[PDB]
Design an enzyme around this catalytic site. Structure first.
Site, mmCIF file in Angstrom:
data_model
loop_
_atom_site.group_PDB
_atom_site.id
_atom_site.type_symbol
_atom_site.label_atom_id
_atom_site.label_comp_id
_atom_site.label_asym_id
_atom_site.label_seq_id
_atom_site.Cartn_x
_atom_site.Cartn_y
_atom_site.Cartn_z
ATOM 1 N N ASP A 57 48.821 64.689 -82.660
ATOM 2 C CA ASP A 57 48.270 63.364 -82.904
ATOM 3 C C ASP A 57 49.415 62.402 -83.208
ATOM 4 O OD1 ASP A 57 47.137 61.267 -85.084
ATOM 5 O OD2 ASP A 57 45.521 61.877 -83.729
ATOM 6 N N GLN A 61 46.234 60.074 -88.280
ATOM 7 C CA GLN A 61 44.886 59.626 -88.616
ATOM 8 C C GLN A 61 43.931 60.251 -87.612
ATOM 9 O OE1 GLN A 61 44.702 57.076 -91.377
ATOM 10 N NE2 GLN A 61 46.683 58.133 -91.472
ATOM 11 N N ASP A 138 29.966 77.327 -93.950
ATOM 12 C CA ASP A 138 29.511 78.714 -93.877
ATOM 13 C C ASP A 138 29.855 79.353 -92.538
ATOM 14 O OD1 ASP A 138 27.462 77.233 -92.572
ATOM 15 O OD2 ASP A 138 25.824 78.096 -93.765
ATOM 16 N N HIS A 142 32.235 82.427 -92.134
ATOM 17 C CA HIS A 142 31.669 83.566 -91.413
ATOM 18 C C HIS A 142 32.674 84.094 -90.388
ATOM 19 C CE1 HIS A 142 28.096 85.626 -89.338
ATOM 20 N NE2 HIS A 142 29.004 85.626 -88.384
ATOM 21 N N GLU A 143 33.282 83.195 -89.615
ATOM 22 C CA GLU A 143 34.220 83.619 -88.579
ATOM 23 C C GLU A 143 35.479 84.235 -89.179
ATOM 24 O OE1 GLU A 143 32.699 83.732 -85.947
ATOM 25 O OE2 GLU A 143 31.129 82.261 -86.447
ATOM 26 N N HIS A 146 34.998 87.771 -90.304
ATOM 27 C CA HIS A 146 35.103 88.816 -89.285
ATOM 28 C C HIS A 146 36.525 89.374 -89.208
ATOM 29 C CE1 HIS A 146 31.124 89.116 -87.612
ATOM 30 N NE2 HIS A 146 31.040 87.837 -87.297
ATOM 31 N N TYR A 157 31.051 96.935 -84.063
ATOM 32 C CA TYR A 157 30.102 95.826 -83.877
ATOM 33 C C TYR A 157 28.870 96.243 -83.061
ATOM 34 C CZ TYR A 157 29.000 90.805 -83.967
ATOM 35 O OH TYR A 157 28.424 89.574 -84.169
ATOM 36 N N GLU A 166 27.940 91.827 -89.724
ATOM 37 C CA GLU A 166 27.331 90.499 -89.703
ATOM 38 C C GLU A 166 26.959 90.031 -91.103
ATOM 39 O OE1 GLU A 166 28.228 88.719 -86.792
ATOM 40 O OE2 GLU A 166 26.525 87.824 -87.870
ATOM 41 N N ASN A 183 26.346 70.840 -101.142
ATOM 42 C CA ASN A 183 25.031 71.205 -100.634
ATOM 43 C C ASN A 183 24.907 72.711 -100.393
ATOM 44 O OD1 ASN A 183 24.073 68.468 -100.481
ATOM 45 N ND2 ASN A 183 25.362 68.255 -98.661
ATOM 46 N N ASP A 185 23.666 76.590 -100.305
ATOM 47 C CA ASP A 185 22.376 77.237 -100.147
ATOM 48 C C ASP A 185 22.611 78.659 -99.652
ATOM 49 O OD1 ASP A 185 22.682 77.121 -97.247
ATOM 50 O OD2 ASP A 185 22.394 74.960 -97.568
ATOM 51 N N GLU A 187 21.175 79.674 -96.795
ATOM 52 C CA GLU A 187 20.862 79.555 -95.379
ATOM 53 C C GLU A 187 22.168 79.562 -94.591
ATOM 54 O OE1 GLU A 187 17.283 78.967 -94.526
ATOM 55 O OE2 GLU A 187 17.566 79.959 -96.454
ATOM 56 N N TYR A 193 23.107 73.077 -87.074
ATOM 57 C CA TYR A 193 22.005 73.579 -86.260
ATOM 58 C C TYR A 193 20.953 72.495 -86.076
ATOM 59 C CZ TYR A 193 18.496 77.097 -84.832
ATOM 60 O OH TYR A 193 17.574 77.853 -84.144
ATOM 61 N N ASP A 226 21.507 92.222 -78.397
ATOM 62 C CA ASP A 226 22.323 91.751 -79.512
ATOM 63 C C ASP A 226 23.113 92.906 -80.139
ATOM 64 O OD1 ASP A 226 23.359 89.952 -81.535
ATOM 65 O OD2 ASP A 226 21.612 90.395 -82.815
ATOM 66 N N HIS A 231 22.710 90.655 -85.408
ATOM 67 C CA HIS A 231 22.334 89.400 -86.062
ATOM 68 C C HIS A 231 20.883 89.386 -86.522
ATOM 69 C CE1 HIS A 231 25.778 88.208 -83.436
ATOM 70 N NE2 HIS A 231 26.094 87.459 -84.476
HETATM 71 C C1 8KN Z 1 27.435 81.645 -87.885
HETATM 72 C C2 8KN Z 1 26.942 81.332 -86.472
HETATM 73 C C3 8KN Z 1 26.765 79.838 -86.261
HETATM 74 C C4 8KN Z 1 27.861 81.920 -85.409
HETATM 75 C C5 8KN Z 1 27.850 83.447 -85.322
HETATM 76 N N1 8KN Z 1 28.836 83.878 -84.338
HETATM 77 P P1 8KN Z 1 29.558 85.391 -84.428
HETATM 78 O O1 8KN Z 1 28.597 86.308 -85.162
HETATM 79 O O2 8KN Z 1 30.905 85.394 -85.109
HETATM 80 C C6 8KN Z 1 29.742 85.912 -82.684
HETATM 81 N N2 8KN Z 1 30.718 86.953 -82.636
HETATM 82 C C7 8KN Z 1 30.648 88.005 -81.699
HETATM 83 O O3 8KN Z 1 29.819 88.109 -80.854
HETATM 84 O O4 8KN Z 1 31.714 88.861 -81.915
HETATM 85 C C8 8KN Z 1 31.973 89.869 -80.977
HETATM 86 C C9 8KN Z 1 33.288 89.592 -80.250
HETATM 87 C C10 8KN Z 1 33.463 88.442 -79.499
HETATM 88 C C11 8KN Z 1 34.653 88.201 -78.844
HETATM 89 C C12 8KN Z 1 35.709 89.105 -78.929
HETATM 90 C C13 8KN Z 1 35.557 90.249 -79.705
HETATM 91 C C14 8KN Z 1 34.348 90.489 -80.355
HETATM 92 C C15 8KN Z 1 26.454 83.925 -84.983
HETATM 93 O O5 8KN Z 1 25.625 84.204 -85.806
HETATM 94 N N3 8KN Z 1 26.192 83.979 -83.604
HETATM 95 C C16 8KN Z 1 24.901 84.408 -83.113
HETATM 96 C C17 8KN Z 1 24.000 83.208 -82.795
HETATM 97 C C18 8KN Z 1 24.455 82.447 -81.550
HETATM 98 C C19 8KN Z 1 23.438 81.356 -81.169
HETATM 99 N N4 8KN Z 1 23.693 80.817 -79.823
HETATM 100 C C20 8KN Z 1 25.098 85.312 -81.908
HETATM 101 O O6 8KN Z 1 26.252 85.441 -81.404
HETATM 102 O O7 8KN Z 1 24.085 85.907 -81.455
HETATM 103 CA CA CA Z 2 18.460 71.296 -87.989
HETATM 104 CA CA CA Z 3 24.585 77.449 -95.686
HETATM 105 CA CA CA Z 4 45.270 59.621 -84.471
HETATM 106 CA CA CA Z 5 24.466 73.947 -97.177
HETATM 107 ZN ZN ZN Z 6 29.221 87.002 -86.901
#
Ligand code: 8KN
Ligand code: CA
Ligand code: CA
Ligand code: CA
Ligand code: CA
Ligand code: ZN
EC number: 3.4.24.27
Length: 316
Positions: A57, A61, A138, A142-143, A146, A157, A166, A183, A185, A187, A193, A226, A231
């Site tokens: 950048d 800013q 979150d 979460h990521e 992992h 997995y 998960e 905020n 929670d 959730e 979302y 899945d 999940h």
């Molecule tokens: C917190 C939410 C917003 C995101 C989350 N993503 P994740 O669990 O980290 C996805 N990781 C995953 O698959 O890892 C395997 C892997 C991938 C690549 C290389 C090596 C291994 C999730 O819950 N996803 C759901 C909902 C998705 C709604 N479209 C979903 O995938 O079904």
């Molecule tokens: Ca919403």
């Molecule tokens: Ca949350």
């Molecule tokens: Ca800029």
């Molecule tokens: Ca929240």
């Molecule tokens: Zn995940």
């Protein structure tokens, strides 16, 4: 890149202003040198080739619409680093201050985020199901969690180990959200979302069944979608974790809550000392019981509440 540490300012996905740690060398880069061996944020430029280019950048800013997902990925990675260091004495995801890398603007209309084995990756969403996913603290936590799991317990997995994987990411994603205290929670993903629907989320830990996920082992999914329901069946463990922290009576089983901090200590110890790549739900219960015993004593309320919570969700 080699340069000098600077402080930029920008706006995130939800329109909130925040300062970000940058590095100056001709351009200002999204490179935070204040945490470990750095936090680095990249532009994937709507493509799928990773990581893309380190975010550059001209003026330090970051108020353009295109900047917002990068601001939040960078900033929330810093919050998550701080949680693990300050709360658990863990230095980055590998425990030795590995550089943390994220790419934003991944693909087109991409309704997901992931750890790819080496870095975090965030879609922009399609604008209807999701907005850019780094806007959820979150989600970011979460990521990154992992990566922590992969370096520690190594939970495979699929099936029950993958549902634990998960749940660990949802649990620590939520604990980081509480740590930042905006905020908070029980959730998952609510901030990014369905912008057209208020009050919903991708998953609920307090009531997984609200979004079709099981809240008792007798309701577990055993098909192949899945990755064997990673999940979906996470709801059983998320519910147990919620009960440990907050308490409640669930399918007639009463759990005395012990609070979020003790939940986090118990699950962090279980993840890093007792779980293995193939742990199942029963083995997680045992790991949590042992962890609570180590931390609080065999006759403690904390141990008793861990047992009640797993009883309440049908895991022996
Ligand atoms: C917190 C939410 C917003 C995101 C989350 N993503 P994740 O669990 O980290 C996805 N990781 C995953 O698959 O890892 C395997 C892997 C991938 C690549 C290389 C090596 C291994 C999730 O819950 N996803 C759901 C909902 C998705 C709604 N479209 C979903 O995938 O079904
Ligand atoms: Ca919403
Ligand atoms: Ca949350
Ligand atoms: Ca800029
Ligand atoms: Ca929240
Ligand atoms: Zn995940």
């Amino acid at each position: 890149i080699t340069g000098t540490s600077t402080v930029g300012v920008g706006r995130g996905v939800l329109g909130d202003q925040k300062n970000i740690n940058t590095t100056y060398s001709t351009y200002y880069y999204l490179q935070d040198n204040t945490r470990g061996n750095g936090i680095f944020t990249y532009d994937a430029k709507y493509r799928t080739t990773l990581p893309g280019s380190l975010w550059a950048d001209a003026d330090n800013q970051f108020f353009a619409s295109y900047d917002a997902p990068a601001v939040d990925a960078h900033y929330y990675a810093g919050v998550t680093y701080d949680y693990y260091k300050n709360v658990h004495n863990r230095l980055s995801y590998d425990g030795n201050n590995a550089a943390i890398r994220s790419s934003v603007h991944y693909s087109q209309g991409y309704n997901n985020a992931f750890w790819n084995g080496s870095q975090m990756v965030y879609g922009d969403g399609d604008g209807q199901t999701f907005i850019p996913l780094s806007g959820g603290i979150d989600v970011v936590a979460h990521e990154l969690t992992h990566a922590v799991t992969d370096y520690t317990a190594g939970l495979i997995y699929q099936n029950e180990s993958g549902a634990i994987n998960e749940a660990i990411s949802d649990i620590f994603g939520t604990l980081v959200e509480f740590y930042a205290n905006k905020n908070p929670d029980w959730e998952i993903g609510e901030d990014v979302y369905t912008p057209g629907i208020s009050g919903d989320s991708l998953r609920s830990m307090s009531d997984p069944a609200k979004y079709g996920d099981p809240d008792h082992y007798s309701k577990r999914y055993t098909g192949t979608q899945d990755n064997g329901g990673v999940h979906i069946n996470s709801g059983i463990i998320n519910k147990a974790a919620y009960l440990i922290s907050q308490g409640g009576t669930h399918y007639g089983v009463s759990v005395v809550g012990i609070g979020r901090d003790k939940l986090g200590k118990i699950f962090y110890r279980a993840l890093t000392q007792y779980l293995t790549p193939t742990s199942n739900f029963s083995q997680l219960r045992a790991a949590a019981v042992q962890s609570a015993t180590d931390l609080y004593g065999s006759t403690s309320q904390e141990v008793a509440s861990v047992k009640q919570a797993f009883d309440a969700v049908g895991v022996k």
